[PDB]
Amino acid sequence: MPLVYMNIIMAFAIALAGLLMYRSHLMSSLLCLEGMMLSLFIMSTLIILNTHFTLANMMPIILLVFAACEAALGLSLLVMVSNTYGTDYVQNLNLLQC
Amino acid sequence: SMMKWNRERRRLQIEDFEARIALMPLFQAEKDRRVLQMLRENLEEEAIIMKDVPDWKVGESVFHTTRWVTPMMGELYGLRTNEEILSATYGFIWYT
Amino acid sequence: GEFGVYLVSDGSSRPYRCKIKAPGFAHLAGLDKMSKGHMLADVVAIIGTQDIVFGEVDR
Amino acid sequence: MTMYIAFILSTIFVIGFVGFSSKPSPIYGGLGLIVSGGVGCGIVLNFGGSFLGLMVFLIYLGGMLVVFGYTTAMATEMYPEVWVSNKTVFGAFVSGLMMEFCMVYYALKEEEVEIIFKFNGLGDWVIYDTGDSGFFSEEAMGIAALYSYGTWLVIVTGWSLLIGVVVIMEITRGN
Amino acid sequence: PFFDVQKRLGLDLDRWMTIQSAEQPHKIPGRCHAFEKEWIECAHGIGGIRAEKECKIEFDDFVECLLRQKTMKRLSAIKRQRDKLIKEGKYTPPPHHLG
Amino acid sequence: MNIMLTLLTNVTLASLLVLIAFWLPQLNAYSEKTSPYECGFDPMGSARLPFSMKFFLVAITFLLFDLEIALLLPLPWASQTNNLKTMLTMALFLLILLAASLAYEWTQKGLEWAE
Amino acid sequence: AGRIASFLKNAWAKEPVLVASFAIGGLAIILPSLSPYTNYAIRINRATPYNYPVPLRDDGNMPDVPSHPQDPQGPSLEWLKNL
Amino acid sequence: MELVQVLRRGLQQVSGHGGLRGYLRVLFRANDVRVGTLVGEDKYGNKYYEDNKQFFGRHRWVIYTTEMNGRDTFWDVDGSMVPPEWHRWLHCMTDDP
Amino acid sequence: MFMINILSLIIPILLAVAFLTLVERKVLGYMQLRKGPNVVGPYGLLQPIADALKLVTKEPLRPGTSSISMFIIAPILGLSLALTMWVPLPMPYPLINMNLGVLFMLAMSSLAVYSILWSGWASNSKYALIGALRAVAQTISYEVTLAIILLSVLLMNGSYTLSTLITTQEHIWMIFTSWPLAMMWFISTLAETNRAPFDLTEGESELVSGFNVEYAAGPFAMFFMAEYANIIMMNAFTAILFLGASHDPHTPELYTINFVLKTLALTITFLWIRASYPRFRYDQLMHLLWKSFLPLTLALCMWHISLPIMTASIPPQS
Amino acid sequence: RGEYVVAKLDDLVNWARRSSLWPMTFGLACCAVEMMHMAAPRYDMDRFGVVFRASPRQSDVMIVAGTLTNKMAPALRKVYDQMPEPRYVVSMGSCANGGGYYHYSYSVVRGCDRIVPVDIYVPGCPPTAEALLYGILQLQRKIKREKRLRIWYRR
Amino acid sequence: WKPPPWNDVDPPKDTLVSNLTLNFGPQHPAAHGVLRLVMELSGEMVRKCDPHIGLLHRGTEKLIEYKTYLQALPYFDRLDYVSMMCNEQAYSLAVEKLLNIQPPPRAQWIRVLFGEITRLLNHIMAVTTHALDIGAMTPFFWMFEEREKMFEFYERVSGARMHAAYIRPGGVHQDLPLGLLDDIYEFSKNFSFRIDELEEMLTNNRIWRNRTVDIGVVTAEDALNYGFSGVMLRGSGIQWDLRKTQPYDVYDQVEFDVPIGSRGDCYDRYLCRVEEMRQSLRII
Amino acid sequence: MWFEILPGIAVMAACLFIPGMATAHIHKFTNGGKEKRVAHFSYQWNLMERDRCISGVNRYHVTKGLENID
Ligand SMILES: CCCCCCCCCCCCCCCCCC(=O)OC[C@H](COP(=O)([O-])OCC[N+](C)(C)C)OC(=O)CCCCCCCCCCCCCCCCC
Ligand code: SF4
């Protein structure tokens, strides 16, 4: 399979790993989220444009407009976290515990 | 005023399109001869270079069916120059 | 506003003590009540209309 | 060079992804992602996706990530945790520059790389298809089908987006 | 679907796009319309598992039409042998190769 | 070919412009010169604090509207369809949904953002 | 009646903007239904020949389709240039 | 017709300022191309003018000399170059030279 | 000879930018009974050169709490976008005849906000930070009306190809069909371009200088150049959009006469407005756009999406 | 020779430095509004090429205009350092020059030069608008007689 | 580990918001160069504002104890430095009151004429400078051309531009130069047009109103109790004016319409001032 | 007066003049007098590739008509 296709596939994998391998900023975790779909948006356009799947051309936008909606939730949840705690830290996001 | 002008452009567009419709026969025939001729040039090159391969019968039909398939562009311009490849793949695409 | 001068004369040829009623002083004093419930870009507006010049409010 | 131009574009895309995935400072993480966002459209533009390529620039490059800068401007971790501040992020960056450099070398010699999927290291240009599109841009006609055949999709997308503004206020209201 | 409501009331919601050989805007084809049409009509009213083996020739041909794996593998071996041959200087490309 | 060349040439011309705008006027520097300026007094330590919700709220609302306008760029090509009746119904449906989200936003305090 | 006229005028007193937009939106959603040119719009939209009308095999007994792109048979758009 | 007269007055400015040389001289030395009647001259080379048609202020003005007390002053300009007896008239403190 | 054409476009644009400050200073000055620069050269013709090379020779202090690298990339992004704004313009025959030039032009214009965000962040000052955040939220709020207006206006054109705009306006100006949108477009560009009354981004009286609070000499020139470069191109974009002009294929000269005259006149109105109206306030700025501008734009877009079907005057996409 | 080529290069820099210096008026007292009167279309120093610019990082010359107090003193100094080189300060008014009327009082610094290196001393109480405009003319004349490149050549 | 709280409302942490004490001025252009305004903000919303004054504090009263009455007179000229002659009016009225000496009627009429000319001087900058901070800059030079004209009038009589030192205890120092009444009459005729110029520019403009209307409103009682005076009260509808209630000098032998507003916000005072401009022109 | 502003904008007319005149003349000069034949769709592009191949000098702008056919 064309060398180009693997570049986005490995781009997703390292982006997915960055989403899973946390640190101290779910800001940075969120940045791995839309980037993860950005590879999905980029890759999806690649096959769809290549194979001349004309009606499928809608889907890259459909993926786009919905993965964008998650940012609305994700960032809104963030300021809620950065309100009761002030910051966007993750190790302090453990109030649940028991 | 814009209503009348736009209607005139639509008459102009279909007039332009109709000229293209008349131009399809010659263009299709010319491209039809060109693409298969250039494929034959590829096959002719294949049986001067794969003669030494232990198992390479020239012109293997990669697809199982006998139905014609449009040449994939890789086997079309693969043995051409850098200029031929660039001007064919993204030649329309670049065109600022 | 009301620019008043209060001086006490000691009976000599020179003033003994002169206090001046600066209209800006009271107005700048009320600038706190002005700014309540207003935009920061409106604090400049209220400051402008309060006709404050600091040579007068600072004595 | 122009032999493998899209090889380059996809290569900066990978390193651009390694940037923000290495968890740098969120403003700099945005920089690494938008760089990948910018270079990615060029990959799409090379394939004829002019409209789709321009979209990520308009709604994602200059769109989504702009409001992201606000949360970064809102968070403002008490010291910048940029690349030089931490040493594991450098290790993440240095590592993330290794395998794709390793495997592209693996690819470019024998073309037989079998990581998960069988991948060919052949030039990007090959998989293109030969044939005129007449006067209708295939990308434009497909997108314009939103209002012709994508009736069901656009209702659900519209309804969900309408719910999107409903939820956003409710969560951000804070009772 | 789990509840094929589309089939019951006969209103088309998604299946217009689910395959590329269906109706297309301005009546323009996909890359592999010919192969997908052949595989699809082979595997109608047959069963998923039955068509897994019976309509095998059509599927692989259609997959090769879409991915174009073995075809460019053919080309890659052609190019690899060429660069392993002309560099040593036994055969020279004809003028039409170079224009 | 010409496109990224135009981006390249513009990027260089910008970079040489800033380059000799730095090294050529380099004369002398001090810490006070590099010190932050805050209306002419001492900076107490700032630019590290959150700004309530209103700037964030309008940011999210912009994105949601921006995503909805993203759905309606293809209209000039959509007008060239064969079934206009399907088009004008759906295109209108997007438009009054823009209104509905704005209309909902307005009545529930909304664009009268926090203070 | 009295309330409606008062409310509309009273609304047009404080806000002229949204009443104008509501009038525009309320208007533009209506005329396309009763417009006599929408049928023309689709007709000229259908008349544009983006793709080539591939000929059909002449097996006889279809007089509707012409044998030459000048014969009176077939679809005609004499209305179009007048429209 | 009015625009013709204004253009005619514009050309008269060049003729008044000693042809092309003087017109370019005063423009690049005083940013003024308006010409008025000669009113006086000190023992310094300071040409003095007056034009009642102009509004109060610019109605009387000056172009300074080229040599002042053994100092080059063709490019540089100073306000204190004016002698005292003429400083009275120049500042409109007295409307008679 | 493509490269020479690229230079033949960018230096003259920059040369016009420098003289803006002169005409900015002079038209403003005369508009208020003043004179404007008339001492430095004939009628102040040399003032931009004096201003430009002085700021070039002025030492470029960087703030102590700067990210240097971010302090430099942002002005680079600001000016590079400003020049690349002009590459698809339909100047008789457009340089880069991108079929989606309008989409290209919008994307770069939206991407210009990254200069604002990084300018405030890299400066690292409370005044700079809030001034930048206030600046970016103003412009990003005004993107939505910017895109909708084009969608409505271009709907009668046929596509996003900027060159096609000439054919549409061959008979009458496009403003006559969409004058409600014309003023709708013009104000939104004024807010985008960050000119009075939409100067809160800079806030010369109350926000020091906004994102340029610290930017001095060298790196200030880029922002000042990028700001004024966008002024021409936005006015030029409005010039082609609504105030179209005839273009004879055998004489593209006449179209250049009309386009240049129109775009300079439109720029004249920009500072004309700047010399007449008080500065806006954020709540007014936010409220005006989202309460009296968005609903009007939405309805007008609804009017222009149905009108071609209403009158069977849909435009050809080619 | 090199002396001639360095004489024209500094002249080119000399031209802008005396024609594009953007002033700042540290508005303090009646001297400030007096400066504001020179801002009227009566004089319009902008016609000389100088425009009132805030953000001290952008300006070249700053004008003290009014009486200086100990309270105002540390801020006026510190803003002077952050003013980029070359930086010139002009003392407008007797109070700024040497205290003037408020020269003996307990809360005025006698003369602004005790805080900053004054370049041009403008007398007046207040100095009439064109008199302060004259001082600006002197500053450009003083700027004209500089040998920055000449000194480095002999350095 | 501890059991979860019964109400599930885990206890709120310490305060995570701040009021961002901001050091407004003095270099800031809107701070008149000499202001140390400091205030607290909840976002854009302001809680309290401390106008730190003193950045221009001078001896003034301290040295007046050591200067004679004549020597102390120029202090008032530099006190409210925009209203030059009006301050000396206060000093001369006070000093002559203690001396039980009244100035000749000619002196009284000169004082009121320049006093209202000073009223033109002060009101012009009061609105135009507010117009500068509010945005639109042109009204400044627009009218500061006129401000030069009565400044030229100041020079003709006293001999100085700003600090006239004209109003002295016992009348005025000198008499007007011959014909000065004529030139000021020419200015008076043309000045009413210039006032119309401003009202055309600002009064009906939406941007100016929305930045000014319903802003900084105060009730009558708080305004009076806060020690306010002049327009600050008259804008809030308070029926009071010194020239009318307690007519000093010759202000009794002249009628003028005090422009009382009825809102108390920023806008009412602006209209109150511009009418005071016209009513000042009546006095001339 | 106000006409002293005109030299300020007269130069501007020259500055904005250059980009329009250049790209017009370079397009004319490079493409043998004719304007740059634009290809917004693949059809117009493959039209040129026929022209470039059919010219015999590998330039599309070289036009050669009835003088060739026999
Ligand atoms: C069949 C017919 C179909 C179409 C009919 C359409 C309706 C009839 C036409 C209506 C008017 C046009 C559309 C609306 C335009 C106004 C939108 C709006 O919100 O207005 C009120 C708005 C807001 O006014 P407001 O804020 O006082 O009140 C709004 C209403 N409330 C109070 C409820 C919020 O006005 C402005 O924003 C003022 C201008 C701001 C910008 C400052 C610079 C102005 C420069 C003006 C001169 C230059 C003009 C250049 C024009 C272009 C040249 C190329
Ligand atoms: S020098 Fe005179 S005019 Fe200037 S501030 Fe001091 S007292 Fe006032």
PDB file of N, CA and C and ligand atoms in Angstrom, chain J residues 28-32 34 65-68 92-97 99-102 122 124-127, chain K residues 56 58 74 77-78 81 162-163, ligand 2:
ATOM      1  N   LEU J  28       1.941  66.376  32.630  1.00  0.00           N
ATOM      2  CA  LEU J  28       2.008  66.598  34.065  1.00  0.00           C
ATOM      3  C   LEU J  28       1.166  67.787  34.508  1.00  0.00           C
ATOM      4  N   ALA J  29       1.406  68.970  33.952  1.00  0.00           N
ATOM      5  CA  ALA J  29       0.747  70.175  34.438  1.00  0.00           C
ATOM      6  C   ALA J  29       0.424  71.109  33.282  1.00  0.00           C
ATOM      7  N   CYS J  30       0.134  72.378  33.584  1.00  0.00           N
ATOM      8  CA  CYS J  30      -0.213  73.346  32.546  1.00  0.00           C
ATOM      9  C   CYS J  30       0.767  73.349  31.382  1.00  0.00           C
ATOM     10  N   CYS J  31       2.002  72.893  31.590  1.00  0.00           N
ATOM     11  CA  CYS J  31       2.897  72.699  30.460  1.00  0.00           C
ATOM     12  C   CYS J  31       2.381  71.644  29.492  1.00  0.00           C
ATOM     13  N   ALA J  32       1.616  70.664  29.974  1.00  0.00           N
ATOM     14  CA  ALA J  32       1.143  69.596  29.100  1.00  0.00           C
ATOM     15  C   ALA J  32       0.062  70.100  28.156  1.00  0.00           C
ATOM     16  N   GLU J  34      -0.340  73.083  27.415  1.00  0.00           N
ATOM     17  CA  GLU J  34       0.371  73.990  26.521  1.00  0.00           C
ATOM     18  C   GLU J  34       0.949  73.237  25.330  1.00  0.00           C
ATOM     19  N   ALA J  65       6.609  67.679  30.772  1.00  0.00           N
ATOM     20  CA  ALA J  65       5.789  68.877  30.619  1.00  0.00           C
ATOM     21  C   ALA J  65       5.015  69.078  31.913  1.00  0.00           C
ATOM     22  N   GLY J  66       5.612  69.802  32.848  1.00  0.00           N
ATOM     23  CA  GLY J  66       4.982  70.098  34.112  1.00  0.00           C
ATOM     24  C   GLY J  66       5.929  69.894  35.270  1.00  0.00           C
ATOM     25  N   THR J  67       5.391  70.100  36.466  1.00  0.00           N
ATOM     26  CA  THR J  67       6.183  69.994  37.680  1.00  0.00           C
ATOM     27  C   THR J  67       6.382  68.538  38.076  1.00  0.00           C
ATOM     28  N   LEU J  68       7.575  68.232  38.573  1.00  0.00           N
ATOM     29  CA  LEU J  68       7.962  66.883  38.955  1.00  0.00           C
ATOM     30  C   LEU J  68       7.958  66.747  40.470  1.00  0.00           C
ATOM     31  N   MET J  92      10.351  71.025  29.329  1.00  0.00           N
ATOM     32  CA  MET J  92       9.448  72.114  28.980  1.00  0.00           C
ATOM     33  C   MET J  92       8.931  72.747  30.264  1.00  0.00           C
ATOM     34  N   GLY J  93       9.129  74.050  30.397  1.00  0.00           N
ATOM     35  CA  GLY J  93       8.595  74.791  31.517  1.00  0.00           C
ATOM     36  C   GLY J  93       9.614  74.981  32.628  1.00  0.00           C
ATOM     37  N   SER J  94       9.407  76.047  33.403  1.00  0.00           N
ATOM     38  CA  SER J  94      10.311  76.345  34.507  1.00  0.00           C
ATOM     39  C   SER J  94      10.258  75.264  35.578  1.00  0.00           C
ATOM     40  N   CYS J  95       9.070  74.716  35.840  1.00  0.00           N
ATOM     41  CA  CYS J  95       8.952  73.662  36.842  1.00  0.00           C
ATOM     42  C   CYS J  95       9.751  72.429  36.440  1.00  0.00           C
ATOM     43  N   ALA J  96       9.657  72.035  35.172  1.00  0.00           N
ATOM     44  CA  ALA J  96      10.442  70.899  34.708  1.00  0.00           C
ATOM     45  C   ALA J  96      11.918  71.257  34.600  1.00  0.00           C
ATOM     46  N   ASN J  97      12.222  72.497  34.220  1.00  0.00           N
ATOM     47  CA  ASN J  97      13.614  72.898  34.039  1.00  0.00           C
ATOM     48  C   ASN J  97      14.355  72.931  35.370  1.00  0.00           C
ATOM     49  N   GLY J  99      12.393  73.551  38.646  1.00  0.00           N
ATOM     50  CA  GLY J  99      11.395  73.686  39.693  1.00  0.00           C
ATOM     51  C   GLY J  99      10.507  74.900  39.537  1.00  0.00           C
ATOM     52  N   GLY J 100      11.073  76.006  39.065  1.00  0.00           N
ATOM     53  CA  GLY J 100      10.272  77.190  38.802  1.00  0.00           C
ATOM     54  C   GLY J 100       9.590  77.705  40.051  1.00  0.00           C
ATOM     55  N   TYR J 101       8.276  77.902  39.943  1.00  0.00           N
ATOM     56  CA  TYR J 101       7.492  78.383  41.074  1.00  0.00           C
ATOM     57  C   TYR J 101       7.565  77.409  42.238  1.00  0.00           C
ATOM     58  N   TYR J 102       7.439  76.121  41.949  1.00  0.00           N
ATOM     59  CA  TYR J 102       7.628  75.073  42.942  1.00  0.00           C
ATOM     60  C   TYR J 102       9.067  74.571  42.867  1.00  0.00           C
ATOM     61  N   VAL J 122      13.935  74.032  27.559  1.00  0.00           N
ATOM     62  CA  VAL J 122      12.977  74.973  26.989  1.00  0.00           C
ATOM     63  C   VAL J 122      12.486  75.879  28.111  1.00  0.00           C
ATOM     64  N   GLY J 124      10.244  78.925  29.869  1.00  0.00           N
ATOM     65  CA  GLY J 124       8.852  79.317  29.762  1.00  0.00           C
ATOM     66  C   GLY J 124       8.087  78.875  30.993  1.00  0.00           C
ATOM     67  N   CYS J 125       7.000  79.586  31.274  1.00  0.00           N
ATOM     68  CA  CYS J 125       6.108  79.245  32.382  1.00  0.00           C
ATOM     69  C   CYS J 125       4.702  79.734  32.074  1.00  0.00           C
ATOM     70  N   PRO J 126       4.005  79.074  31.145  1.00  0.00           N
ATOM     71  CA  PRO J 126       4.457  77.977  30.287  1.00  0.00           C
ATOM     72  C   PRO J 126       5.204  78.517  29.082  1.00  0.00           C
ATOM     73  N   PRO J 127       6.055  77.720  28.444  1.00  0.00           N
ATOM     74  CA  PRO J 127       6.641  78.156  27.176  1.00  0.00           C
ATOM     75  C   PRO J 127       5.572  78.194  26.102  1.00  0.00           C
TER      76      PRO J 127
ATOM     77  N   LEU K  56       1.023  64.613  41.426  1.00  0.00           N
ATOM     78  CA  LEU K  56       1.288  66.004  41.088  1.00  0.00           C
ATOM     79  C   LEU K  56       1.212  66.893  42.324  1.00  0.00           C
ATOM     80  N   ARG K  58       1.878  69.317  45.209  1.00  0.00           N
ATOM     81  CA  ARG K  58       2.856  70.376  45.382  1.00  0.00           C
ATOM     82  C   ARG K  58       2.572  71.103  46.686  1.00  0.00           C
ATOM     83  N   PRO K  74      -0.379  84.242  41.534  1.00  0.00           N
ATOM     84  CA  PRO K  74      -0.110  83.313  40.425  1.00  0.00           C
ATOM     85  C   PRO K  74      -0.279  81.849  40.783  1.00  0.00           C
ATOM     86  N   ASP K  77      -3.537  80.542  39.312  1.00  0.00           N
ATOM     87  CA  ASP K  77      -3.475  80.340  37.869  1.00  0.00           C
ATOM     88  C   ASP K  77      -2.966  78.946  37.532  1.00  0.00           C
ATOM     89  N   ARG K  78      -2.046  78.425  38.335  1.00  0.00           N
ATOM     90  CA  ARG K  78      -1.497  77.095  38.136  1.00  0.00           C
ATOM     91  C   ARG K  78      -2.257  76.029  38.906  1.00  0.00           C
ATOM     92  N   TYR K  81      -5.348  74.639  35.981  1.00  0.00           N
ATOM     93  CA  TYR K  81      -4.577  75.283  34.927  1.00  0.00           C
ATOM     94  C   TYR K  81      -5.335  75.409  33.616  1.00  0.00           C
ATOM     95  N   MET K 162      -1.139  81.679  28.919  1.00  0.00           N
ATOM     96  CA  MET K 162      -1.960  80.951  29.876  1.00  0.00           C
ATOM     97  C   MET K 162      -2.141  81.705  31.181  1.00  0.00           C
ATOM     98  N   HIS K 163      -1.056  81.878  31.927  1.00  0.00           N
ATOM     99  CA  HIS K 163      -1.151  82.369  33.298  1.00  0.00           C
ATOM    100  C   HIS K 163      -1.174  83.892  33.252  1.00  0.00           C
TER     101      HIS K 163
HETATM  102  S1  SF4 M   2       6.780  75.703  34.501  1.00  0.00           S
HETATM  103 FE1  SF4 M   2       5.023  77.108  34.849  1.00  0.00          FE
HETATM  104  S2  SF4 M   2       3.465  76.433  33.336  1.00  0.00           S
HETATM  105 FE2  SF4 M   2       4.986  74.747  33.476  1.00  0.00          FE
HETATM  106  S3  SF4 M   2       4.126  73.347  35.053  1.00  0.00           S
HETATM  107 FE3  SF4 M   2       5.526  74.764  36.154  1.00  0.00          FE
HETATM  108  S4  SF4 M   2       4.171  76.453  36.854  1.00  0.00           S
HETATM  109 FE4  SF4 M   2       3.005  75.313  35.265  1.00  0.00          FE
END
